[PDB]
């Protein structure tokens, strides 16, 4: 998973 | 059929109603795959980008339907930025946001609102919608449908 906007 | 096979009819742009007939097939279809979840978020984030408000009002329900019926297999994949984004894209200005109906929008609101409610657990869920209010996305908290099972 990534990172928020 | 496959998943794509239900949405596409479940979020058909021609549909003259909804119809529950393939958004609960989609969602059993969800609860057989082993990949059911990572698929579905995947294609439910694409139909409901679409500049066609009838086929991503549709996705939405049906993706309200899959919270009610996928469990927490699609709960966590829901959880995570990678869907999340997709939502936030839809809502936020900067992105979709001034193209986007305010159908649509408030949806997404009100759903993302609700999870972080019904989910507690889910904590990207909150961070996520907490940007859309520190971001001036949305001004206070929408009212809701009554639903107890939100805990």
């Given at each position: 998973?990534?990172?928020?906007? | 059929?496959?998943?794509?096979?239900?949405?596409?009819?479940?979020?058909n742009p021609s549909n003259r109603q909804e119809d529950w007939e393939y958004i609960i097939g989609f969602?059993?279809?969800?609860?057989?795959?082993?990949?059911?979840?990572?698929?579905?978020?995947?294609?439910?984030?694409?139909?409901?980008?679409?500049?066609?408000?009838?086929?991503?009002?549709?996705?939405?329900?049906?993706?309200?339907?899959?919270?009610?019926?996928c469990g927490r297999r699609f709960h966590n994949e829901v959880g995570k930025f990678r869907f999340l984004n997709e939502l936030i894209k839809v809502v936020s200005?900067?992105?979709?946001?001034?193209?986007?109906?305010?159908?649509?929008?408030?949806?997404?609101?009100?759903?993302?609102?609700?999870?972080?409610?019904?989910?507690?657990?889910?904590?990207?869920?909150?961070?996520?919608?907490?940007?859309?209010?520190?971001?001036?996305?949305?001004?206070?908290?929408?009212?809701?449908?009554?639903?107890?099972?939100?805990?």
């Amino acid at each position: 998973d990534d990172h928020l906007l | 059929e496959s998943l794509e096979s239900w949405l596409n009819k479940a979020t058909n742009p021609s549909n003259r109603q909804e119809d529950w007939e393939y958004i609960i097939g989609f969602c059993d279809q969800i609860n057989k795959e082993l990949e059911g979840p990572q698929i579905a978020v995947r294609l439910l984030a694409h139909k409901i980008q679409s500049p066609q408000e009838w086929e991503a009002l549709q996705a939405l329900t049906v993706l309200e339907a899959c919270m009610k019926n996928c469990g927490r297999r699609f709960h966590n994949e829901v959880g995570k930025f990678r869907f999340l984004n997709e939502l936030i894209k839809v809502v936020s200005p900067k992105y979709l946001g001034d193209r986007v109906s305010e159908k649509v929008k408030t949806k997404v609101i009100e759903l993302l609102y609700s999870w972080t409610m019904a989910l507690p657990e889910e904590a990207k869920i909150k961070d996520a919608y907490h940007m859309l209010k520190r971001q001036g996305i949305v001004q206070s908290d929408p009212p809701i449908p009554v639903d107890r099972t939100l805990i």
